[PDB]
Design an enzyme around this catalytic site. Structure first.
Site, PDB file in Angstrom:
ATOM      1  CD  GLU A 272      -3.140   0.353   0.060  1.00 30.99           C
ATOM      2  OE1 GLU A 272      -3.241  -0.879  -0.223  1.00 30.99           O
ATOM      3  OE2 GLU A 272      -3.815   1.236  -0.472  1.00 30.99           O
TER       4      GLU A 272
ATOM      5  CG  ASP B 155      -2.527   9.073   6.842  1.00 33.06           C
ATOM      6  OD1 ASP B 155      -2.338   7.871   7.161  1.00 33.06           O
ATOM      7  OD2 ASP B 155      -2.808   9.458   5.687  1.00 33.06           O
TER       8      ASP B 155
ATOM      9  CE1 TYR C  96      -7.772  -0.398   6.578  1.00 36.66           C
ATOM     10  CE2 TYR C  96      -6.466  -0.346   4.569  1.00 36.66           C
ATOM     11  CZ  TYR C  96      -6.564  -0.168   5.942  1.00 36.66           C
ATOM     12  OH  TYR C  96      -5.485   0.235   6.675  1.00 36.66           O
TER      13      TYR C  96
END
Ligand SMILES: O=P(O)(O)OCCNS(=O)(=O)c1ccc(OC(F)(F)F)cc1
Ligand SMILES: *Cc1c(COP(=O)(O)O)cnc(C)c1O
Ligand SMILES: N[C@@H](Cc1c[nH]c2ccccc12)C(=O)O
Ligand SMILES: [Cl-]
Ligand SMILES: [Cl-]
Ligand SMILES: [Cs+]
Ligand SMILES: [Cs+]
Ligand SMILES: [Cs+]
Ligand SMILES: [Cs+]
Lengths: 393, 268
Positions: free
Chosen positions: B49, B60, B175
């Protein structure tokens, strides 16, 4: 799936990580419920009246327009508790937080006014408030940071990215993506993911509603145009909303032109940016050729953001509202002129709106026009800025 | 191509889970990033990834925020990332390559053009971190037109409707978020709820990879045991970069040791 339309034409949406979608859906449902709830409305109205001081005055400014066919009124959001229009919507959002059973408030701030507004609403209404602020902004806004701390809010400097408003916006969403179960994100303008552009408009729409009633009382007719500065879009959409269906009433939004559009040092994405996706929304934004989010600039921190709320982009697209820009120097002249001729010290943000109205008057002084400027805030905060600049001249 | 499908079939034949590291492309520079990625592969990464540096990475935590900053300090642009990706694919024909994107980098110049460039360089999947399924239509349609798997996120408490959507819309892998919040090794997620993993299988979803907060071999083993096809680790990998900026040789050695250990945990 949503209860309300997340889009204004092509603009808006809910461009958040999947993890935040339940929080947005929960907020939308609570908002829709609150809007139908007479008890909520009465509580909100009571705070606006007895705590914030609504309705705000509508002041006719005769000295400024002498010798012209312009009649100019100022909608006096500068007189609202806290010294800016932001107080209206923070009180509504605080009540929504409580309706949902939330005990904590997250807010972003750049200029610091939203941080202060969030802090005051949280103090009044028994909420624990944390405020994200880019480290560069913290350094520049000692007064507001101190006010926030006096009101019991936690101020958290943001050192990531450009350490300014957009970076604080990101951090607020990062926090909320982990804390939504207990915290409400009190977004500071009519931008970001649905339902915020809608909620903020609805919680600011009393500006335009009052203006309409006041101008009808005083003049017996609607304005030819209402003029407001555009940072993220809240004070302008609050002034515009109640006039949207009055087709004769011009809606003019004023973006910051900074050092001049041609310099690239400005905050005028609606007219000079490019559509992108950032901060949960599809909207015009200042961006690099490659699509990194650019640095905006204005003398006035309240206007200094590289994007704009989606409803403005939409109203522009269909021609319902016109958007213009005003430079730092134009805003400074308007500030000085209002001080000297009307005894009102305007926020430098609001001074952008006033500057455009002065231009409308001066360019065509025999044009009969009835104008309202939204005086979004008072300019006590700006006196040193204006002092320091005018120390050279 | 069918790189994820081929990988999962091979892993299933070995009764084995996937270990998939994340790094930011061009962190801490282009040449070192290329060496890092080759190290990850040699140490046993099953897939990658790879993040394209973006100004505003709002999914993030600090570790990856700082990776983005380091890449920008090195002048890394999306065009340079695409150059890197072409080179990576040229060296490594079968390893699945997934990008971690933010919407503006995919949109700003044309969604279709972005996915076409992914196809040209041999990318296998794109996860757009700030595009929820609700907004995904133009992204997933462009992805599929260019033989790119659009990756969707299954939050730990996804309801039935969301599970059905993620199962239907996604390809390559699903995911599976370990927890709410943002990326970060300093916050450990939960075991995959049997219900989610089983529901995804019921709905014929792409095989699940668990991600967020995976930083230890035990977590990789646990993810696979719970019925996930594998696990993704980012911050833990990026921390080794951050720790060893002044020691590029040691950086590679530590990345090798870590990835080897994480991969070992995935084996039956
Ligand atoms: O190990 P950690 O905790 O650093 O997690 C690393 C994850 N890296 S990634 O590219 O899979 C990844 C996947 C999804 C992300 O956001 C989203 F869920 F909103 F889409 C962000 C990063
Ligand atoms: C914050 C602020 C603005 C700009 O924000 P909008 O959301 O565009 O209204 C304008 N005027 C004042 C006084 C402000 O404090
Ligand atoms: N920077 C101003 C107004 C503001 C708050 N949040 C924003 C988001 C976008 C644009 C402007 C703003 C303040 O903090 O008071
Ligand atoms: Cl009333
Ligand atoms: Cl100029
Ligand atoms: Cs009053
Ligand atoms: Cs006049
Ligand atoms: Cs702006
Ligand atoms: Cs094992």
């Amino acid at each position: 799936t949503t209860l309300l339309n997340p889009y204004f034409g092509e603009f808006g949406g809910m461009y958040v990580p999947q993890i935040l979608m339940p929080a947005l859906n929960q907020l939308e449902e609570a908002f829709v419920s609150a809007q139908k709830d007479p008890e909520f409305q009465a509580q909100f109205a009571d705070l606006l009246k007895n705590y914030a001081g609504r309705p705000t005055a509508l002041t006719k400014c005769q000295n400024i327009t002498a010798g012209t066919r312009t009649t100019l009124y100022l909608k006096r959001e500068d007189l609202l508790h806290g010294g800016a229009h932001k107080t209206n919507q923070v009180l509504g959002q605080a009540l929504l937080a409580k309706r949902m059973g939330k005990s904590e408030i997250i807010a972003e701030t750049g200029a610091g006014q939203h941080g202060v507004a969030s802090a005051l609403a949280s103090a009044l209404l028994g909420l624990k408030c944390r405020i994200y602020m880019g480290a560069k902004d913290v350094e520049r806004q000692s007064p507001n940071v101190f006010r926030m701390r006096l009101m019991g809010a936690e101020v958290i400097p943001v050192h990531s990215g450009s350490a300014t408003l957009k970076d604080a916006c990101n951090e607020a969403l990062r926090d909320w993506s982990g804390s939504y179960e207990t915290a409400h994100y009190m977004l500071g303008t009519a931008a970001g993911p649905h339902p915020y552009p809608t909620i903020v408009r609805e919680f600011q729409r009393m500006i335009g509603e009052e203006t309409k009633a006041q101008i009808l009382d005083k003049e017996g007719r609607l304005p030819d145009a209402v003029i407001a500065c555009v940072g993220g879009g809240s004070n302008a959409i609050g002034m515009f909303a109640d006039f949207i269906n009055d087709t004769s009433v011009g809606l003019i939004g004023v973006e910051p032109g900074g050092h001049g559009i041609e310099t690239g040092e400005h905050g005028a994405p609606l007219k000079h940016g490019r559509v992108g996706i950032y901060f949960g929304m599809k909207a015009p934004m200042m961006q690099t050729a490659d699509g990194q989010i650019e640095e905006s600039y204005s003398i006035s921190a309240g206007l200094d953001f590289p994007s704009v709320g989606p409803q403005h982009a939409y109203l522009n697209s269909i021609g319902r509202a016109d958007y213009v820009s005003i430079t730092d120097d134009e805003a400074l002249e308007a500030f000085k002129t209002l001080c000297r001729h009307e005894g009102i010290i305007p926020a430098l943000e609001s001074s952008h709106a006033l500057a455009h109205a002065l231009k409308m008057m001066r360019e065509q002084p025999e044009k009969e026009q009835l104008l309202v400027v939204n005086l979004s805030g008072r300019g006590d905060k700006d006196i040193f800025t204006v002092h320091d600049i005018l120390k050279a001249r | 191509m069918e790189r994820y499908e081929n990988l999962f079939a091979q892993l299933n034949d070995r009764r084995e889970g996937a270990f998939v590291p994340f790094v930011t492309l061009g962190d801490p520079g282009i040449e070192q990033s290329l060496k890092i990625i080759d190290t990850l592969i040699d140490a046993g990464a099953d897939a990658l990834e790879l993040g394209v540096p973006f100004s505003d990475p709002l999914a993030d935590g600090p570790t990856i925020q700082n990776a983005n900053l380091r890449a920008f300090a090195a002048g890394v642009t999306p065009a340079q990332c695409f150059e890197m990706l072409a080179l990576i694919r040229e060296k490594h024909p079968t390893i699945p390559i997934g990008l971690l994107m933010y919407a503006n980098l995919v949109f700003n110049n044309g969604i279709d053009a972005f996915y076409a460039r992914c196809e040209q360089v041999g990318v296998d999947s794109v996860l757009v971190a700030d595009v929820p399924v609700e907004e995904s239509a133009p992204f997933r349609q462009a992805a599929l037109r260019h033989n790119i798997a659009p990756i969707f996120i299954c939050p730990p408490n996804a309801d039935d409707d969301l599970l059905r959507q993620v199962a239907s819309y996604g390809r390559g892998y699903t995911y599976l978020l370990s927890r709410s919040g943002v990326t970060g090794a300093e916050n450990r997620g939960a075991l995959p709820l049997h219900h989610l993993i089983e529901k995804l299988k019921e709905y014929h979803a792409a095989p699940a990879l668990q991600g967020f907060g995976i930083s230890s071999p035990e977590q990789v083993s646990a993810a696979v045991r719970a019925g996930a096809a594998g696990a993704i680790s980012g911050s833990a990998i990026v921390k080794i970069i951050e720790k060893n900026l002044a020691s590029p040789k040691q950086m590679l050695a530590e990345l090798r040791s870590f990835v080897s250990a994480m991969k070992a945990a995935s084996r039956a």
